[PDB]
Design a protein around this ligand. Structure first.
Ligand SMILES: Nc1ncnc2c1ncn2[C@@H]1O[C@H](CO)[C@@H](OP(=O)(O)OC[C@@H]2O[C@H](n3cnc4c(N)ncnc43)[C@H]3OP(=O)(O)O[C@H]32)[C@H]1O
Ligand SMILES: Nc1ncnc2c1ncn2[C@@H]1O[C@H](CO)[C@@H](OP(=O)(O)OC[C@@H]2O[C@H](n3cnc4c(N)ncnc43)[C@H]3OP(=O)(O)O[C@H]32)[C@H]1O
Ligand SMILES: [Zn+2]
Ligand SMILES: [Zn+2]
Lengths: 615, 615
């Protein structure tokens, strides 16, 4: 019922196409013949003129192939063959391929094309000596009547190799992508050319990718991302080696990674240098600006020789914050520079903490929050890069409830929680900046543990808002236990003492509660050995091996004076033996513990999977 | 430095093997020849005796392959070819394939085996007609001096076309898996056979699997299991159609699915029929056996016309339980029969609930729990089928704390919690029966909500043990909220009223808390419309669409008189439009919400993925 085209190759022995056209069962239409320059085709044309008028025979010749000496012209013939198969518009269900005729390599190319593109039947024809000729027991060369006689009395074989399936993306495709060129053209006869070997590279790379995927099909659920299955064996072996922070190639690779940020404070971004000057030279009221004064950093501040405690760590960012963000222009400018920095670092999703009520003097905290939200929305709408018309970096908001050692600090917590609930219920567009949770931070000790604020957070739990708690930075595991089991926290920050209790660590691992680590902040405050030279070993590797969803963050960019890339590199330095697959696992954990919707999570997963740079 | 083996076919034209042997810049060792028993090889051995005495060539002839008549001859030649390639412990980098000689199909199969097995070089040799012969302009015939003369004068071309890579898991295989027979054994010349076409089927399956995987590479993250990527397009389309409970094929497919059980009561298994008699005829002391009396079931009990309340449902299983299980023989037989039923149903992992203290009259509850654990452990050890030497079904234990409307029940709750903690601390082997959590079931109302039992479960939370709660079966969403946020429940049972509160549903979906539903029990107690003909619609589809991890279980197998297959089919009946992929998603959710270790979870994931039957 199908059209049943017949593709055949021709050598220097004519009367092959007449034999192949005669098939016990096939009603062939539109016979196609592929041949070189020298063979003659008069006999075939006479056959199809006298015995089958309606078969509209077409003959194609390769432009510059007449005798093969090297491999260069074989590649030309193969490329022209592939484009010639592609030139017509036929599915595999109506393709019959005959490999008889031509050089020994031409038949191999015939079968390779048939098994790659797909065909209904691959076969070849044989005939034995039956004609007396001038020399006894001679093959029937010509003089069609003896070919028909041999068919009728019946010794022709027609060995049927069988059907072929073909790769699915190559079954149809299009010929406009890979066209041919006609050099000279007479009736039903052509000479053709191809500019390049694009189809060869396309086919080769798709087969190579398929071979790699078949090679890496096991150990797939252990892989953080699916695209890693398309990597070569050498690349995968290199991925399992320990990361070397000194090597510039490793630094470039880490800088080229898509990243997710979950712990970043807005008030500690621009505290020194040119960034502070740029923020200051944007105020609407320059008259009321406080006099410029930069706190002096300790010796070798990025990597101090001695640890320092919290008080001067907070005082080190006195040049920015409440003293400076009280001006609306400064707040806007701060937001723009933070978004620019996040985009430059390669982050694709970030959550930013803020304390709007600290910046309200004549305006309400609602106005401050609206200003921050509008500035971030305008920044996201400005940079419509990335595929699908989505912002380069998506920013969500988290509000901070601060607790202090003494004074008046507990009314502000209530104001922040109420504002967070109202704002979360106000803005609800999925593809926009939103308030997605609250955070309990500040001074921590025995008297300010988590279970003393349950009555304040009951309303937050009633309204359905996510909660993160700072715990374990300067306390034992009891604070972490109370945060987990009394405030129903979903994420923990600076849980450095989680390893003191095995049962608590098992509970955190089993419940999927995320942990956030900041290598620079932890090293600068608690002190830690570097390069394997009494706080103890850094607990990153222990958490990774135990099964905890641990992530690496930046905390205060300005105060600690570094970014995500530097934090990852020092994470490698603090735990010798850390691998690159561990970095990918960290990114996967950050994706899984984010405070986002399911569709956004899937989109981020796809975006990160295809963005990992190769060695 | 490689050995550089050479493989070449030969037809009715000698002096081709010596020409291919003289490949420039290649020192060959142990050249191999494949023939069709028709031609002669005297020339080959004569040449290798005089000009290369250290190459120890071999010659092979194919199993009565006289001439090409039909396709069976070609198939036998191809099978002998593949087994001949395998029966030489050779790597990809030292194979050199020459597709010169024999039929066109012979050279084509040469190239096919080269590109599948991954040769290191494929080439084709040509010669120039430079010999006088008896008629001028002749190819160089048998004699060797003229072959050497033509090599010296530069009349050989050696068209060589690229190396090959080959599929990775097929690069080695092993000779002792598709062996060759030896019909006749003469010096350096052999005739070989092959029992069957096993390698052909192996290769066809491999290529088809690779092609299907390449066809379905996208939409892989959405697939619950990876093996679904190896299904054909028709099967995948059939997977998305709505389930038809009336179709016998669908019934067989559901019965053939690997399953996970998470809500099963031990005391409600054998309550009627032959199973109850079998349990009764196992007592150590039949004198104290209470008289037999089976409660009568309502009309059309499996699908009753009107719902019944909990009291009659519980009284329906009075023939078994506390009255019967105080005798250890009956308890042991009960456990054996339940494990047999679970294996028959196809369950690969199950968690069983029990109340040992209810069966302690002269023995301690510790002895009863030890007997139950020993019975299940012995049952697991006995049936060590399945790959890896693992038990067919793995059973873990959960202990019930029962609350009642009036009477003395809190002491029993404290007893059960303490026993659970001690038992969980006692048995710690990963590949063994273990106690993994506690349950809060029984009578529920306003006065017996979850937050009235916090002080009793604080110890369980300190020791790090999983908790599940019966909530929502006969209460509004307030009970579910209290269970989630005051008792830190990890999984909920019969949460039929979760949809009344949107915030609670969103929180449950975000936190990953599991929900268990029992179709038959829910229909029998609450009443629900069937086939889409006021309790409202059954909430399976809403929970699935909202992202809640929802699973389907059996509750009481005996009282409700149904199994997992019946429950899944009735779930399809309760929500028209339920698809088969939805059943797979339910299985994945059950796997994700279980109380097991990570290694066991990975093993179960692989086992379920590699065991889904095809349509
Ligand atoms: N000392 C040797 N003695 C004998 N054979 C040798 C020797 N050394 C190498 N070989 C090769 O081994 C195959 C012997 O079967 C031959 O390979 P192949 O050249 O590919 O033969 C195929 C035939 O060449 C013929 N055709 C010659 N021109 C052309 C041409 N320009 N377009 C297409 N076909 C050509 C074809 O016409 P067709 O279909 O009747 O048969 C083929 C020989 O070239
Ligand atoms: N009307 C036609 N006119 C011309 N050619 C026709 C016609 N009908 C079919 N063909 C086929 O088309 C190819 C000619 O280009 C031939 O196919 P092929 O049988 O594969 O020929 C290859 C040669 O058969 C020869 N060898 C004859 N015995 C055997 C045998 N028992 N083991 C292996 N090879 C055999 C081989 O010696 P070698 O290495 O010099 O070249 C091959 C012809 O048989
Ligand atoms: Zn912080
Ligand atoms: Zn139950």
């Amino acid at each position: 019922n199908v059209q049943a085209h017949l593709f055949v190759s021709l050598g220097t022995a004519p009367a092959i196409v007449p034999e192949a056209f005669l098939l016990p069962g096939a009603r062939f239409v539109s016979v196609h013949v592929l041949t070189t320059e020298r063979p003659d085709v008069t006999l075939i044309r006479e056959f199809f003129r006298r015995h089958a008028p309606g078969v509209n025979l077409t003959i194609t010749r390769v432009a510059g192939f007449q005798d093969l000496k090297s491999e260069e012209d074989h590649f030309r013939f193969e490329e022209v063959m592939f484009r010639w198969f592609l030139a017509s518009r036929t599915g595999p269900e109506q393709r019959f391929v005959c490999l008889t005729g031509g050089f020994k390599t031409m038949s191999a190319a015939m079968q390779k094309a048939a098994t790659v593109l797909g065909a209904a039947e691959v076969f070849h024809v044989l005939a034995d000596d039956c004609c007396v000729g001038p020399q006894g027991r001679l093959m029937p060369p010509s003089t069609l009547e003896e070919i028909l006689w041999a068919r009728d009395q019946g010794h022709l074989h027609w060995i049927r190799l069988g059907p072929e399936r073909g790769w699915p993306q190559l079954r149809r495709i299009a010929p406009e992508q890979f066209p041919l060129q006609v050099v000279e053209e007479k009736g039903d006869e052509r000479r053709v050319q191809a500019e390049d070997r694009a189809f060869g590279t396309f086919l080769q790379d798709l087969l190579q990718r398929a071979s790699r995927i078949a090679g890496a099909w096991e150990m797939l659920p252990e892989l953080p991302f699916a695209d890693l299955a398309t990597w070569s064996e050498g690349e995968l072996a290199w991925l399992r080696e320990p990361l070397d922070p000194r090597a510039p190639a490793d630094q470039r690779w880490v800088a080229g990674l898509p990243k997710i940020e979950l712990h970043c404070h807005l008030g500690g971004f621009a505290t020194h240098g040119e960034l502070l000057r740029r923020v200051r030279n944007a105020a609407e009221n320059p008259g009321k600006l406080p006099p410029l004064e930069e706190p002096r950093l300790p010796e070798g501040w990025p990597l101090p020789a001695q640890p320092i405690p919290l008080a001067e760590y907070m005082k080190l960012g006195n040049a920015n914050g409440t003293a400076l963000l009280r001006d609306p222009g400064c707040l806007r400018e701060q937001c723009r520079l933070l978004y620019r920095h996040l985009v430059d670092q390669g982050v694709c999703y970030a959550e930013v903490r803020c304390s709007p009520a600290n910046y309200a003097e004549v305006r309400s905290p609602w106005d401050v929050l609206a200003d921050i939200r509008a500035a971030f929305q305008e920044c996201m709408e400005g940079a419509r890069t990335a595929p699908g018309g989505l912002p380069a970096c998506h920013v969500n908001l988290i509000l901070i409830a601060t607790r202090r050692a003494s004074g008046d600090y507990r009314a502000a917590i209530a104001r922040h929680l109420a504002l967070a609930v109202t704002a979360a219920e106000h803005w609800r567009d999925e593809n926009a900046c939103r308030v997605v949770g609250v955070d309990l931070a500040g001074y921590e000790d025995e008297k300010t543990r988590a279970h003393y604020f349950r009555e304040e957070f009951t309303a937050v739990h009633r309204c359905g808002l996510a909660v993160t708690v700072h715990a374990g930075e300067n306390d034992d595991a009891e604070g972490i236990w109370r945060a987990v089991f009394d405030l129903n926290a979903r994420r923990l920050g600076h849980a450095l003492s989680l390893g003191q209790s095995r049962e608590l660590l098992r509970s955190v691992a089993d419940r999927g509660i995320g942990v956030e680590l900041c290598p620079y902040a932890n090293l600068q405050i608690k002190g830690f050995r570097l390069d394997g030279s009494a706080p103890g070993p850094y607990p990153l590797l222990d958490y990774l091996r135990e099964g905890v969803r641990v992530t690496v963050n930046t905390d205060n960019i300005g105060i600690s004076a570094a970014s995500l890339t530097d934090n990852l590199l020092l994470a490698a330095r603090l735990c010798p033996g850390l691998t690159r697959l561990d970095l990918l696992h960290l990114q996967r954990h950050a994706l899984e513990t984010a405070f986002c919707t399911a569709t956004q999570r899937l989109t981020l997963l796809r975006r990160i999977s295809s963005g990992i740079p190769r060695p």
